[PDB]
Design a protein around this ligand. Structure first.
Ligand code: 9AK
Length: 132
């Protein structure tokens, strides 16, 4: 089936993706059928970026699990780009619902999800970010 090339990451997975020119950006691994384009080349994954909803063919080597958060979260880009803050929100919101986490503005709503993420996604850890 699709994405069976002996590489990491399958459909539904929350990831950081690295496009030349940009900070690591949050994405979801999607099937090529959702993209309205074509099958990915071997060793690549279609992702849909949080915040803008666009599609990219990205190598599996330029993707890491979103759960490795503090390692790829980019504090500078977060302070500089409103689009990145926007992206964080939609990314973390999706993570929250998956992990069965709940929290009590925008920057104000982001704050505890950001802390949860940076803190290691407690109590479930990264296990709680899986699809299904
Ligand atoms: C998602 C990209 C293409 N890596 C950057 N998008 C910036 C505007 O949201």
């Amino acid at each position: 089936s699709e994405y069976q090339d002996g590489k990491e990451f399958g459909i539904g997975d929350l990831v950081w993706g690295k496009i030349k020119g940009f900070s690591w950006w949050p994405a979801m691994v999607v099937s090529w059928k959702a993209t309205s384009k074509r099958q990915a080349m071997s060793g690549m994954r279609w992702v849909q970026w949080f915040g803008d909803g666009k599609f990219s063919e990205v190598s599996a080597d330029k993707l890491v699990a979103l759960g490795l958060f503090s390692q790829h979260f980019n504090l500078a880009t977060f302070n500089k780009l409103v689009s990145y803050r926007k992206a964080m929100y939609h990314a973390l919101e999706k993570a929250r619902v998956r992990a069965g986490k709940t929290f009590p503005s925008l920057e104000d709503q982001l704050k505890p999800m950001l802390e949860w993420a940076h803190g290691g996604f407690k109590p479930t850890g990264i296990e709680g970010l899986k699809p299904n």
